[PDB]
């Protein structure tokens, strides 16, 4: 719950933890009409406003 | 008639004016087209979707 209140407060510490977890941790970017196997591709996230 | 209206103004007849890049600060070759287009906002806001 302390971490919950931390993330809700948007404490600056949380962003560093986010950069740690996102460091190299692919995520799948998929479109709506998934026709061929390329319709889902992994990507390294890069946090952006 | 569009060229005539431009002629009444002080703007190039062709409608193309040279533009200078914001970052480098030097000219763009091949003058580009700039005018006033009427643009809407459509009811698909990102924060409604995200």
């Amino acid at each position: 719950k302390a971490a919950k209140k931390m993330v809700e407060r948007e404490e600056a510490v949380v962003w560093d933890i986010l950069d740690e977890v996102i460091r190299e941790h692919p995520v799948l970017l998929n479109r709506a009409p998934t026709l061929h196997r390329l319709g889902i591709q992994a990507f390294e996230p890069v946090l952006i406003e | 008639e569009i060229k005539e209206l431009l002629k009444l103004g002080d703007l190039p007849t062709s409608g193309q004016i040279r533009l200078y890049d914001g970052r480098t600060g030097e000219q763009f070759e091949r003058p580009v087209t700039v005018g006033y287009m009427y643009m809407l906002k459509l009811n698909h806001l990102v924060d409604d979707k995200m």
């Binding site: - | 006033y36 287009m37 009427y38 809407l40 009811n43």
Partner: protein
């Protein structure tokens, strides 16, 4: 006021009903964001039941897609107005022209 229009802006703005089009020509006695008061010409007004005209402009209220629908006065205080003319510019309108 879209620069490149097709001259149909008048009809859509006036007939869409958003703009509080006048009903009897007159002079804008009292103007305000809330209401507009019109002194109808004596010739244009009936002999009996003389009275004057009042429009209560609709303020910020929910539109059916949650967008804002509102009106603003577009006539200065103490000015003539022609019968059947725009007085308040509905949303996406100005001077009785469709400006989306």
């Amino acid at each position: 006021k879209p620069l490149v229009g097709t001259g149909m802006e008048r009809a859509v703005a006036v007939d869409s009903g958003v703009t509080a089009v006048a009903k009897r020509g007159g002079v804008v006695q009292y103007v305000d964001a809330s209401r507009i008061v019109i002194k109808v010409n004596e010739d244009e007004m009936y002999p009996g039941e003389a009275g004057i005209d009042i429009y209560n402009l609709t303020k910020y209220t929910r539109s059916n897609q949650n967008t804002c629908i509102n009106q603003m006065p577009c006539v200065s205080l103490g000015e003539p107005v022609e019968r059947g003319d725009v007085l308040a510019d509905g949303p996406s309108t100005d001077l009785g022209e469709l400006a989306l």
